[PDB]
């Protein structure tokens, strides 16, 4: 089961330091669970700009989530989600970076709010896309709906809403069962 999975995680100024750390720990939890499988991983932080923290070929070389994320620094700027998702589609899923032609493409987006930019994500639409929206900005059904445009269909499966960043641990507990 070859899966190329990318974490696209929010580094905007609205995240508290401990919240940003909980995202990193969540990504490590998932990668450790899937060590020695046919999964490959890449990770991109987005805020105003988009930084690839590691590509698939970095993961293949190291297979060490702690080492791969050791130097991540919280950008503390905007939340340009449209640009970020397009970036993943065109700049991360590439064979030259270790992506596999035969693999199933998965994108896991983690964010605390609405995009600050605009456009479309059509270039990424064939990727299986989950989005995890966390915190006070997604308490109403109306506010939760703003995330649907980024995720695969139906939203009932592919959009996860969490009350706090502490619930990422609980989400992992549930996800790990699906392995
Ligand atoms: C179920 N599901 C799922 O919840 N998420 C998921 C993972 C993460 Cl980090 C956050 C969120 Cl929020 C959602 C996933 O990535 C999958 C989709 N599937 C790959 C696919 C296979 C096919 C197919 O048609 O064969 C389509 S997509 C593999 C699943 C999976 C991957 C990793 C863990 C763990 N730990 C548990 C399950």
Curated annotation (Swiss-Prot):
It is found in: Cell membrane. Residues 4-175 form the VWFA domain. Leukocytes. The integrin I-domain (insert) is a VWFA domain. Integrins with I-domains do not undergo protease cleavage. The I-domain is necessary and sufficient for interaction with ICAM1 and F11R. Belongs to the integrin alpha chain family. It comes from Homo sapiens (Human). In resting T-cells, up to 40% of surface ITGAL is constitutively phosphorylated. Phosphorylation causes conformational changes needed for ligand binding and is necessary for activation by some physiological agents. Glycans are attached at residue 36. This is Integrin alpha-L. Heterodimer of an alpha and a beta subunit. The ITGAL alpha subunit associates with the ITGB2 beta subunit. Interacts with THBD. Interacts with CD226. Integrin ITGAL/ITGB2 is a receptor for ICAM1, ICAM2, ICAM3 and ICAM4. Integrin ITGAL/ITGB2 is a receptor for F11R. Integrin ITGAL/ITGB2 is a receptor for the secreted form of ubiquitin-like protein ISG15; the interaction is mediated by ITGAL. Involved in a variety of immune phenomena including leukocyte-endothelial cell interaction, cytotoxic T-cell mediated killing, and antibody dependent killing by granulocytes and monocytes. Contributes to natural killer cell cytotoxicity. Involved in leukocyte adhesion and transmigration of leukocytes including T-cells and neutrophils.
């Amino acid at each position: 089961m070859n899966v190329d999975l990318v974490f696209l995680f929010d580094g905007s100024m609205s995240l508290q330091p401990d919240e940003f750390q909980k995202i990193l720990d969540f990504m490590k939890d998932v990668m450790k669970k899937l060590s020695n499988t046919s999964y490959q991983f890449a990770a991109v932080q987005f805020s105003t700009s988009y930084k690839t923290e590691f590509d698939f070929s970095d993961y293949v070389k190291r297979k060490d989530p702690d080492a791969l994320l050791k130097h991540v620094k919280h950008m503390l700027l905007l939340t340009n989600t449209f640009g970020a998702i397009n970036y993943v589609a065109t700049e991360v899923f590439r064979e030259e970076l270790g992506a596999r032609p035969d693999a199933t493409k998965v994108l896991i987006i983690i964010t605390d709010g609405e995009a600050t930019d605009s456009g479309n994500i059509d270039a990424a639409k064939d990727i299986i896309r989950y989005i995890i929206g966390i915190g006070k900005h997604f308490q109403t059904k109306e506010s939760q709906e703003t995330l649907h445009k980024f995720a695969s269909k139906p939203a009932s499966e592919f959009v996860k809403i969490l009350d706090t960043f502490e619930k990422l641990k609980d989400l992992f507990t549930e996800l790990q069962k699906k392995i």
